[PDB]
């Protein structure tokens, strides 16, 4: 019984059956078609330098209400316009137009966080510093 | 290109990092024997795990084959010469019952305190790292020396090191010249 062919010669049947049931794992097809180097906004990178176009009011999901103060950036290498979160308090006002910020992933591989809807990314630096340092006032920004 | 100098890490971090039991037990270890960072404890338990790994997978071999005989008697020889293993426990089962503090007992950190010399484990620590401790004729400044059998005889001070006579040092000298100028003339 049990389904599988338990035969002492049945290994090609066994291995083909395994190889073709692997794709239903979310990650085997995701590497092996090549989907990061095809159509995720980054090319397998973790951070990308981008250019600020817009400041966006993304309003949070259902058990919350807040306007989240995100930013709408464009990549350098690839041209994608993409939302990005500007993290902790008051650091929207540290960013103006076209500020060449640095984008990271967000904590769940490439899905959203909590109650910003649809966003994948975040900013960590603006034009070559940081945001932690700027927020704790331990670094002052150069002026271009 | 000259070959890579091979190197390795010397410990394993624990797998569930916030367990109250592991915290309090390792805290009694560290605050008992004056251990600086838990890199020390995890290195000790790593050495214990390596010998425990070889002991399990060597004990699985049959009696009277020269691999088990050879590596077994040499392993017990090493533990005897370090001193964590008793003189009559020499069997491949008693080696796996070792706890961590049995390996902490043979640290020269502890051996200075056990032989006297300090009035504290912590004073032993500051004395070893300020280099007044010479095993025979070699100074150490390593608290985690993992001391051996015969040289526990030879734990004492140095031919330098003002505790071991021979030209007292800095603050004593400055106070000597200070009292000489302030009270002599």
């Amino acid at each position: 019984g049990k389904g599988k062919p338990r035969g002492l010669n049945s290994a090609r049947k066994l291995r083909v059956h395994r190889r073709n049931n692997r794709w239903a794992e979310n990650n085997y097809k995701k590497r092996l078609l090549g989907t990061a180097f095809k159509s995720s906004p980054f090319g397998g990178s973790s951070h990308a330098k981008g250019i600020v176009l817009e400041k966006l009011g993304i309003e949070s999901k259902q058990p919350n209400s807040a306007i989240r103060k995100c930013v709408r950036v464009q990549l350098i290498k690839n041209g994608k316009k993409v939302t990005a979160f500007v993290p902790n308090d008051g650091c929207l006002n540290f960013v103006d137009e076209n500020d060449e910020v640095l984008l990271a992933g967000f904590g769940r591989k490439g899905k959203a966080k909590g109650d910003i809807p649809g966003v994948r990314f975040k900013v960590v630096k603006v034009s070559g510093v940081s945001l932690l340092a700027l927020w704790k006032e331990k670094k002052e920004k150069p002026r271009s | 290109p000259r070959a890579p100098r091979t190197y390795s890490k010397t410990y394993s971090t624990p797998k569930r990092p916030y367990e109250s039991s592991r915290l309090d037990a390792e805290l009694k270890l560290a605050g008992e024997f004056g251990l600086k960072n838990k890199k020390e404890i995890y290195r000790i338990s790593f050495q214990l795990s390596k010998i425990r790994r070889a002991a399990r997978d060597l004990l699985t071999r049959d009696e009277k084959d020269p691999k088990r005989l050879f590596e077994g008697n040499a392993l017990i020889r090493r533990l005897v010469r370090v001193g964590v293993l008793s003189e009559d426990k020499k069997k491949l089962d008693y080696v796996l019952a070792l706890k961590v503090e049995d390996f902490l007992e043979r640290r020269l950190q502890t051996q200075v305190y056990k032989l006297g010399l300090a009035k504290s484990v912590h004073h032993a620590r500051v004395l070893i790292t300020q280099r007044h401790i010479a095993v025979g004729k070699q100074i150490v400044n390593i608290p985690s020396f993992m001391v051996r059998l015969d040289s526990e005889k030879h734990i004492d001070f140095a031919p330098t090191s003002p505790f071991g006579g021979a030209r007292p040092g800095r603050v004593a000298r400055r106070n000597a010249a200070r009292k000489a100028e302030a009270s002599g003339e």
Partner: protein, 120 residues
């Protein structure tokens, strides 16, 4: 255990053994607890909960008024509430040795029975 006995007696107060885990790491309220609450439960009687004299409270009033602050400023100085500070002035309060220790470490005023009013 003779050698560490001498070591821990050479350190602060300790006991004849000192290896057992005291508990509640930021429960800073365990000054008065472990002997008195297990008295008042076991009593099955009525006990007298009393604060000492309002001279301590007027010492607080004099020291605060001399240091040019208010009650609320003193509460946000000692990380407690205005109500507990205000009752500690006006003598309708109950004691807490821990809070009295913060009042002394912020003011430098003896709040201790016989002697009142100097940073020791």
């Amino acid at each position: 255990a003779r050698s560490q006995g001498q070591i821990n007696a050479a350190r602060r107060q300790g006991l004849v053994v000192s290896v057992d885990k005291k508990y509640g790491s930021t429960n800073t309220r365990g000054d008065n607890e472990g002997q008195r609450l297990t008295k008042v439960d076991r009593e099955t009687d009525i006990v007298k909960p009393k604060k000492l004299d309002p001279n301590v409270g007027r010492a607080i009033s004099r020291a605060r008024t001399d240091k040019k602050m208010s009650q609320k400023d003193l509460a946000t100085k000692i990380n407690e509430k205005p109500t507990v500070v205000n009752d500690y002035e006006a003598a309708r309060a109950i004691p807490n040795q821990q809070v009295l220790s913060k009042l002394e470490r912020a003011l430098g005023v003896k709040l201790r029975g016989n002697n009142i009013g100097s940073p020791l």
